[PDB]
Each structure stands twice: as structure tokens, then as C-alpha cells.
Enzyme design. Structure first.
Site, short mmCIF file in Angstrom:
data_model
loop_
_atom_site.label_atom_id
_atom_site.label_comp_id
_atom_site.label_asym_id
_atom_site.label_seq_id
_atom_site.Cartn_x
_atom_site.Cartn_y
_atom_site.Cartn_z
N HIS A 175 42.08 25.20 -25.71
CA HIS A 175 43.49 25.24 -26.36
C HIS A 175 44.04 24.03 -26.82
O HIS A 175 45.43 24.20 -27.24
CB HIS A 175 44.42 25.64 -24.98
CG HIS A 175 44.59 24.51 -23.95
ND1 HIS A 175 43.79 24.38 -22.69
CD2 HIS A 175 45.10 23.37 -24.08
CE1 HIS A 175 44.39 23.43 -22.17
NE2 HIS A 175 45.14 22.52 -22.86
N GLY A 187 49.18 16.08 -20.62
CA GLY A 187 48.19 15.13 -21.06
C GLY A 187 47.03 14.99 -20.65
O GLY A 187 45.82 14.46 -21.00
N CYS A 242 44.84 17.44 -19.67
CA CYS A 242 43.61 18.45 -20.04
C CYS A 242 42.41 17.70 -20.43
O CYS A 242 42.58 16.66 -21.09
CB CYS A 242 44.27 19.62 -21.11
SG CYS A 242 45.58 20.45 -19.92
CL CL Z 1 48.32 20.11 -16.06
#
Ligand code: CL
Ligand code: CL
Ligand code: CL
Ligand code: CL
EC number: 3.4.19.12
Lengths: 306, 306
Positions: free
Chosen positions: B41, B143, B145
Site C-alpha cells: 500500500h 507512519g 506501517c
Molecule cells: Cl496504523
């Protein structure tokens, strides 16, 4: 979202840990630049912890009496000296992974991460708080002496705890990295016992702000209290008194949430008086006091779930 | 003595973390040998997470479209490909701090440590468990991920979680390091919600053994139960059924403490039926299910406080 006890990543300090052995005793040391720190009880014997005189016990040995092992690499000791309850063994090698660092004496109430180690090798890390009675509820087995506690600001590691002893009730006592114990404790096998503890009020209050920043409001109420009325209630439930200095500390969280501290105090005094019946806060049934206002700001959003 | 949630020291994995940016999105990647893993993503746009087709979104870019930053050092990407929900970007440089490692798909119930990271830089570590509903109650802000979960056996790091999404109730969903989600979740901004969870029975039972190894006996009782009777009670209080495989797993702890599993089951069914009135276990009011039998053996003594 979420809220968990969290420790500082432990790498910069893992690369500081060595094994010091003296006679039959092996424990952990911290190795920064050319020096390795460890509990001076490393020289005490197969129980003559009953009444050690350390000035005397230490004058009976030389440099070659301590062996320091960094992985599979013997550090030669080339000088040693005692600083309160710690020894400081100079080695022929500067640690090349020494992080930027500081030694700080932390204060009751504050929190820090503990890297637990055995025979010099890190085995787990966890967060705790210095209790008001100057112990810490750590988790430590035989061999963990010399395990350190630290916080990390930017890239600087601020060491504040080295582990020395376990007390009769199972809580732990040790020193800062200048060798001065936290609390009335001594590095001798005595009858000595943690005194009565109290709940860190400032912390519980910070953690209620955390539950509102995260988005929970259910314990709030339309009351306010004076400091004075609050503390007369605190003291009954064995909470530390709250002072105007703690009130001030909670200023930022209070401004992020629109809740006055003394209004938050009313709400706690309620939680104290009415119990948490049946409900949880950030997952706990029980008011949690091992988070500081700074841990809550570090970990929480800068924007309130309003 | 003591018993705390504890994470694995995080150094070997800290030296794996980089920052991947694509367009305006920045998140974390893991860098082992010549390859960097991150959530696919990372290419999805300023919200076209509403209905991404990734095979299509990815064919619209090249290698120079991703920049990978290890500290202040740009990694050149020289090839990339998609593996289920993850991208794998080949870089011109092999990470020289790659630990010995494995990728494992962990199972509901098991625990692992999470290093939370922002913009590639580690910021804290904490332990959790894969819930039966395939989420984890992490603590993650914008932030994070690409933050990973891992266990460490010997010197081998076994990666098992990479973080992708937060769900409506505030719990977290992501994948293993082959890119396959845990749970029915997809990397798209959909209505999707964690399903109902259940308490990890095997874990609670392990943590009662932990309270007796540490030296507490107060919830035990002179009864025993069959598996069948136990589970009819479990199911009422929303505990996972216990099977003979879980019974077997608790064999070692049972032999260290002289308490039969089914006798431990009776005791829990009691705790379920009679509440924990007023008393705590290892410090908790509440049966705790985020410790496995292995975490309890790792952390506890090999000798029982009898
Ligand atoms: Cl998250
Ligand atoms: Cl002294
Ligand atoms: Cl100890
Ligand atoms: Cl898929």
C-alpha cells in the site's frame, strides 16, 4: 491508536553488555569506552555477603582476578577501583559500539526500560517504574546482577539503574551508575525489606489523560476539587499526595484534552470512592501508575480523539 | 522472582529497518541481505485505498519511483516485485547487519515482540499476542506501517508480522513476511471490522502455572474436571475450547508444579464461576492470556517456589 507499556529499543545497550567473573561468581557488566561497570558484590564470596567489608575484600585482589568476556573475546583488565557499590575495571580495549550516553539518577515515579541479561547475554527487555519505596517490580532470576535500566533521548542513552539485589517480597533494589543505591538498601545479605509503597498519583492522572486522548471519556464528571480536598482523599486510599508541581506537569495533556487537572482529580477521587465497577480504562480494571506524563505524550497522538 | 510481559531485545532487528517513500507516502521497510520488504500500500495514493488494483498501480512505476533510506544513506533500488500484500525492492547493497533469520507464520494464541518504527527509525518495543480473531492489540500511530513483529531463538530472528492497517475498534491487522494477511483482512479501505474474540485458554492456564512456580497457590482447589465439563463452562465465559493438544502442551509446567492440568482446569473453572474476589494473581485482577506456556518457561525459574 492503542496503549501498551513500551520499552525503548534495546540495541544501543545490547552492544554494551559483557560478562564479568571473579572466582566462582559470574554476572553482567556494562562496557562503555575503556571501562566496564559491575556490582562490587561480584567479589563477595560463596556467602560472605553476610558481613562483607569491601575495602578489605578488594585489596585482596588484582587485575587478573576479574575476567571480562565480550562474546568470545577476553578483555584484559589493566586497572580497577571501587565507586560506592560498583566496581569499575579498566580494560585494554575501548568498546567500539559505545553509544552517546549519560548517567542519571532517576526519581521515584519515573519509568525506564530494563534489559535483563544472563552471563553477559541480553535476554529480554521490559519497562518499569522506580517505586516510591525505591524498589522496582522487575523480573530477574539468578545471574541477572548487573542488568541495566536506561531511557533513550534522541540518540543519547541515559543509564539510570544497575541491578544488585532481590528483596524478601520479590521486588528488586540496585543503584545508579555511580554506585549509589536507590533507597535505604545495602549490598549485604541482611534482614532488610522494601518499606510500604504508595501509588504514583501523577502517573495515574497521566494515564487518564491517555484514555481521553485515545478517545475515552466515561469516568469524567461535572465536579472539581481543591488540591487540599483531593489529598485528604488520596491519603486515605494510599496515593502520594498531589502537589502544585505535579499539577503543573499535567499542563500540556490538560490543554490537549480541554480537561482541567483538578477536574481530572475530581474524576479520580470518584474512581477511588465509587470503584471502577465493572468497567475498564485503556483495557485495565485498575488504575495504572506506571506511566509518566512523558511516556503518555511520547506514545500518544498529538491530536485528541475528540 | 517477578513476572512481566517481556519482549525480545530488539537490536538485531533495529539494524534491519529502513524508510521507503513512494510519492508522498513514507513508511518503514525491513532490509535483509540485498532486499527490502514493505507494505505494497506504499504505492497507493492520497486515498485510492478505496478501491486499489495493485497489479495495475504497480505496473505504472519503476525502480527509481521508490527511495529507500538507511540512516542518511540512499539505497538505489535496482528491481522490485509484489508478493501478495508486500513489495520486495532489490537494492544495490546487501545489509551488512542482516542477522541469521527465518520467516514464520505464527498461529493464533502465540506471542511476539513488535518494534514500532516511524520513518524508518525504531521507537519502542512491546510484546503482544495474535488474537484468536487475527488482530493484535498493538499501539501504532500514523507512519508505523511496515513495523515488524519477531521472536528470537538463539541468534536466529524469526520474523512473523508486518504492520499494514488499523481497524475501526483500534486494533491492528497485517501480514506475515510473505505478504499473506492474518485474518480475513485486505489492504484496502473498506468496511471491515475485527470479528468477535475469545480468551486464549491455553495461555491463561500457563500463567496460573507461572503464579504457582513463583510461589502462589491460593486459587487451587481439591477438584478435578473432565475436559468436557471444562469446555461447557469455558464456552459460556467466551474462552476457547481446550483440547487434548493444549492439555499436552502444559505437561512440563504441570510436572514442575505437581498440579494436574485438569486440576488446574477445575481451579480456572472456579475462578470463572466465583470471580477473583478481591485477590490478584501475579499482580493482576483479571485472568491474563497473553503469555504462552513457552514464555512462561523462558521467563520462570527452572526450580519451583514450593
Ligand atoms: Cl496504523
Ligand atoms: Cl556505601
Ligand atoms: Cl536477583
Ligand atoms: Cl491477496
Amino acid at each position: 491508536s492503542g496503549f501498551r507499556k513500551m520499552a525503548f529499543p534495546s540495541g544501543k545497550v545490547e552492544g554494551c553488555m559483557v560478562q564479568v567473573t571473579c572466582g566462582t561468581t559470574t554476572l553482567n557488566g556494562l562496557w562503555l569506552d575503556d571501562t566496564v561497570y559491575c556490582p562490587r558484590h561480584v567479589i563477595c564470596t560463596a556467602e560472605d555477603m553476610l558481613n562483607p567489608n569491601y575495602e578489605d575484600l578488594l585489596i585482596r585482589k588484582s587485575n587478573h582476578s576479574f575476567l571480562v568476556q565480550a562474546g568470545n573475546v577476553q578483555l584484559r583488565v589493566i586497572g580497577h577501583s571501587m565507586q560506592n557499590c560498583l566496581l569499575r575495571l579498566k580494560v585494554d580495549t575501548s568498546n567500539p559500539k559505545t553509544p552517546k550516553y549519560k548517567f542519571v539518577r532517576i526519581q521515584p515515579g519515573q519509568t525506564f526500560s530494563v534489559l535483563a541479561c544472563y552471563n553477559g547475554s541480553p535476554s529480554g527487555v521490559y519497562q518499569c517504574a522506580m517505586r516510591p519505596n525505591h524498589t522496582i517490580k522487575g523480573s530477574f532470576l539468578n545471574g541477572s546482577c548487573g542488568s541495566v535500566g536506561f531511557n533513550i533521548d534522541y540518540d543519547c542513552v541515559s543509564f539510570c539503574y544497575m541491578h544488585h539485589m532481590e528483596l524478601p517480597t520479590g521486588v528488586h533494589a540496585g543503584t545508579d551508575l555511580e554506585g549509589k543505591f536507590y533507597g535505604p538498601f545495602v549490598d549485604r545479605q541482611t534482614a532488610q525489606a522494601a518499606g510500604t509503597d504508595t501509588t504514583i498519583t501523577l502517573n495515574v492522572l497521566a494515564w487518564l489523560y491517555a484514555a481521553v486522548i485515545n478517545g475515552d471519556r466515561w469516568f469524567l464528571n461535572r465536579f472539581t476539587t481543591t488540591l487540599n480536598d483531593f489529598n485528604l482523599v488520596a491519603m486515605k486510599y494510599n496515593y502520594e499526595p498531589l502537589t502544585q508541581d505535579h499539577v503543573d506537569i499535567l499542563g500540556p495533556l490538560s490543554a490537549q484534552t480541554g480537561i482541567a487537572v483538578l477536574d481530572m482529580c475530581a474524576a479520580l477521587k470518584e474512581l477511588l470512592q465509587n470503584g471502577m465497577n465493572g468497567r475498564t480504562i485503556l483495557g485495565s480494571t485498575i488504575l495504572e501508575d506506571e506511566f509518566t506524563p512523558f511516556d503518555v505524550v511520547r506514545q500518544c497522538s498529538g491530536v485528541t480523539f475528540q
